[PDB]
């Protein structure tokens, strides 16, 4: 069960042409990047297994990003019109598209969605035959797209090419992509007073990002301060859960950790 | 690879 996604962002900067940014992911691994603000804008690798691609790959992708950027400039002009916004405002057009594959490597689902100024705009439905428009401006886009039979056009990449590239990347990156890193776990103790302490359960250097951390007191779930999962910076992730406890009762508390990389769930205690 | 395909909103 794997996935590929491209995320595009165009941002208008009246007085300063729009900026275009692309990132690509396979699962939780960013692999490619493009930034129109760069010294000499080009697609660049961001994961080891993509570095083997020849110059033709980089050149082609670079030219795609440049052409997309120009279309987005035009799309931004249309959107400004649809919403009767003035020529002073900075605005944001976002695109996310790609494919999901099941364990058999076959297409599970395609994705193709857009947002204007942080809010849903238009999205291709799961059937890959119809659109959902978020408002009446989006319906202008919707009608034009229906007239052009846009969803049928999108099927070629979403159902074909997308899955082929995902499969190439899975094979080139087998080591890192098909294998999970289990969390390095441990529990820390932090006195608040002579009467109260924090127990914190750490999960460090795991991949992928999906993880479960729960605290139990005498086996009873304590639903805990839970932080949002954060990047370690080396393509692994980190997260922690903490519970405040009366001093001397630490021994009653256990942290339960669940992760794809663990043969079995882990239970830890402050000792 | 990104889709070789361009559109306009």
């Amino acid at each position: 069960s794997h996935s590929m996604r491209y995320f595009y962002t165009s941002v208008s900067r009246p007085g300063r042409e729009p900026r275009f940014i692309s990132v690509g992911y396979v699962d939780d691994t960013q692999f490619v990047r493009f930034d129109s603000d760069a010294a000499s804008p080009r697609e660049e690798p961001r994961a080891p297994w993509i570095e083997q691609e020849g110059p033709e790959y980089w050149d082609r992708n670079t030219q795609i990003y440049k052409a997309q950027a120009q279309t987005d400039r035009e799309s931004l002009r249309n959107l400004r019109g649809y919403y009767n916004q003035s020529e002073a405002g900075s605005h944001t057009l976002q695109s996310m598209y790609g494919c999901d594959v099941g364990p058999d490597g076959r297409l599970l689902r395609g994705h193709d969605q857009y947002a204007y100024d942080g809010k849903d705009y238009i999205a291709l439905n799961e059937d890959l035959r119809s659109w959902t428009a978020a408002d009446t401006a989006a319906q202008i886009t919707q009608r034009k797209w229906e007239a052009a039979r846009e969803a049928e056009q999108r099927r070629a990449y979403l159902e074909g090419e997308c899955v082929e590239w995902l499969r190439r990347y899975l094979e080139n990156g087998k080591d890192k992509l098909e294998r999970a890193d289990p969390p390095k776990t441990h529990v820390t103790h932090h006195p608040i007073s002579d009467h109260e302490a924090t127990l914190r359960c750490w999960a460090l250097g795991f991949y992928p990002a999906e993880i479960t951390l729960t605290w139990q007191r005498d086996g009873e779930d304590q639903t805990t301060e839970l932080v949002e999962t954060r990047p370690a910076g080396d393509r692994t992730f980190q997260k922690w859960a903490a519970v405040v406890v009366p001093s001397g009762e630490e021994q009653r508390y256990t942290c339960h950790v669940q992760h794809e990389g663990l043969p079995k769930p882990l239970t830890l205690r402050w000792e | 690879s990104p889709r070789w395909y361009f559109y306009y909103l």
Partner: T-cell receptor
Amino acid sequence: GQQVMQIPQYQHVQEGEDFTTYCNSSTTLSNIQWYKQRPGGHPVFLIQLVKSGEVKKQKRLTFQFGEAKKNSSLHITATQTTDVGTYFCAGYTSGTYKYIFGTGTRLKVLA
Amino acid sequence: GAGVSQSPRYKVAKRGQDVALRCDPISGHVSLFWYQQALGQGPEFLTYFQNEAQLDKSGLPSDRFFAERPEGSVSTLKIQRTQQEDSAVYLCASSLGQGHFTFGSGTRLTVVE
């Protein structure tokens, strides 16, 4: 490296009889497209297929894409005189900027 | 416009003379292609433009053939010092990359002695 071949070269069929044209690619395709060129005109797109083994029906036309994505057929049931012209296929391979057209099958419908 | 425009529709050239064929793609189409189609035969790829950039010139048969698209709209295919073998239909197509691939009616070029 790549060749896109179409057979047969031509076909004279009796009105109401069936016509089939076959498209072969030496390399694996991403997707395949079919075009009709009315006599004295140019190729105009009929349909595109993407999935291995896909079958699409478009009026009297049936289009088929092989399991290995190297072969496709266009079939007309009950040909009419109005179906006269050359039918062309075109392959697309990911990574390129090119539509590669077959050699075409000319359909002549005897009334 | 809403369709691909090509001019002239028909051209007679004296062997050894230069010709210029014009193509005007669908409004807003990023992609432009030139194809050559001999009488009774299929289109063969010549060259491809993404906006003004000629990203694939691999089908051009010799140096005598060169295309331009200076403003990323109108394209001109130039054939220098025409030979008999150059007689064909030249088809222009425009697209949004993979999407919306559409041909014009072509320029019918006959090179005569």
